[PDB]
Design a binder for this molecule. Structure first.
Ligand SMILES: [Zn+2]
Length: 478
């Protein structure tokens, strides 16, 4: 069949979570508001079930139970994120350090290590400080860089004696496209005609400005870590990027070039700068002056600025050539001149999960990993997220909700697909399942469940292992 035994010796298995989706205690322990507190409370129409992360999965109180669950599966590692506003309630150093917040993350870190689970920490998982949003529009201003740098530094000082694995940003693609092009995610900015129908924004500039600043904050932080912390702490620092796999809509060459543009715009947007020191040619060509430019100093800094790359994979799309549109309607969403669908002639590329955008296509996992090997020099890679969701359904009896054979099937195929890619050259060192628990799934609220364990939101946030948890327990033996 397949088990951890099939994978290289020393290969790491774990689960992933994020602060805002899991923690709750949104206003406890001195936590300041994030742009997602604001977004969920001020724009409930923009959340499927009009909900928020106030309580979420209550990991702020329940983290000991969480650790116990992952130890029982036999996980090696846990990827979680630190809430910026839990450490610095208004984003900046001069705003004050929150000692109760530090205490929380020490508690979790120590709990994890006491059970032999390695902590991998994400610094930014979208919960950007409201105070910095109000002050200078957050990631739209270059001031974000030094504030982020100071926040990372406090984390290295407080936790770096025990934490040896650091991720700066999680899926900057999703943050920038949904936060600034579609406006469907916090901070909910977009051009007035775009899907989010936002009161402020510019879908043709802001996504590029925000992500340019994320890259610079990342590289700056990497340099800081390598200069002051890596010698005496000996940890690794990286970044998490998401990519779909893009299948050409037909065998034509223009559709093959469309697929290439799709991956350049989603993935290369961040990979090209890190490997080659510049944005992809196609982006520079098609976007011109709306895409900011690295100085030579900055180009030098970003190139090679990582020890590993975290890769998130979920699904694949068909990529179809799009004619230009254009001139007044410029948006990041259409800038690639590619049309992405999950359906071709009424036939979905794979079976569709609870999330409309998620099609089950294990073949694409292999394809993406080999593409990274061949086009980017085969960098050290962790799979930082991979998973699937079922609907939250109030009518199902508990015992039925725990029967998640679709999830088992998803992981089985995807772990086989990952194995075959490793058996070819893929430089993959670990894998993290999204996610340990059902959680706040952003604009979908609690309408969907990604967890390997069930969370009863109506019964005190109780955790119940799903069938897939028992499956992982077997998969992870010895
Ligand atoms: Zn509680």
């Amino acid at each position: 069949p397949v088990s951890r035994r099939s994978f290289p010796k020393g290969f790491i298995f774990g689960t992933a979570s994020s602060s805002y989706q899991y923690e709750g205690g949104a206003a406890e322990g001195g936590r300041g508001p994030s742009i997602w507190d604001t977004f969920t409370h001020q724009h409930p129409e923009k959340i499927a079930d009009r909900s928020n992360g106030d309580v979420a999965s209550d990991s702020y109180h329940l983290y000991k139970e969480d650790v116990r669950l992952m130890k029982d599966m036999g996980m090696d590692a846990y990827r979680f994120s630190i809430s910026w506003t839990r450490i610095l309630p208004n984003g900046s150093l001069r705003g004050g350090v929150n000692k109760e917040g530090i205490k929380y993350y020490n508690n979790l870190i120590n709990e994890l290590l006491s059970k032999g689970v390695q902590p991998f920490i994400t610094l930014f998982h979208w919960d950007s400080p409201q105070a910095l949003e109000d002050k200078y529009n957050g990631f739209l201003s270059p001031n974000i860089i030094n504030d982020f740098k100071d926040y990372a530094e406090i984390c290295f000082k407080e936790f770096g004696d025990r934490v040896k694995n650091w991720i700066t940003f999680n899926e900057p693609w999703t943050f920038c496209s949904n936060g600034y092009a579609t406006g469907l995610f916090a901070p909910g900015r977009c051009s007035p005609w775009e899907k989010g129908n936002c009161s402020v924004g510019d879908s043709g500039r802001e996504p590029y400005t925000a992500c340019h600043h994320q890259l610079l904050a990342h590289a700056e932080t990497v340099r800081l870590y390598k200069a002051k912390y890596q010698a005496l702490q000996k940890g690794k620092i990286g970044i998490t990027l998401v990519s779909h796999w893009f299948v050409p809509f037909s065998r034509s060459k223009s559709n093959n070039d469309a697929a290439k543009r799709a991956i350049d715009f989603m993935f290369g947007w961040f990979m090209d700068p890190l490997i080659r020191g510049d944005y992809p040619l196609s982006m520079r060509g098609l976007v011109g002056n709306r895409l900011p430019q690295f100085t030579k100093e900055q180009s030098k800094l970003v190139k090679g600025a990582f020890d590993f790359i975290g890769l998130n994979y979920y699904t694949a799309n068909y990529a179809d050539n799009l004619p230009p549109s254009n001139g007044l309607n410029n948006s990041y969403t259409t800038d690639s001149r590619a049309n992405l669908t999950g359906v071709r002639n009424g036939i979905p590329i794979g079976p569709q999960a609870a999330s409309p955008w998620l099609y089950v296509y294990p073949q694409g996992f292999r394809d993406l990993l080999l593409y990274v090997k061949e086009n980017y020099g085969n960098p050290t890679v962790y799979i930082t997220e991979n998973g699937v969701d079922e609907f939250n359904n109030k009518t199902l009896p508990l015992q039925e909700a725990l029967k998640d054979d679709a999830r088992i099937e998803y992981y089985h195929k995807h772990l086989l697909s990952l194995l075959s890619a490793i058996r070819d050259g893929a430089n993959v060192k670990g894998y993290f399942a999204w996610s340990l628990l059902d959680n706040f799934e952003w604009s979908n609220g609690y309408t969907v469940r990604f967890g390997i364990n069930f969370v009863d939101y109506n019964d005190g946030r109780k955790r119940y292992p799903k069938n897939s948890a028992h499956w992982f327990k077997k998969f992870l033996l010895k």
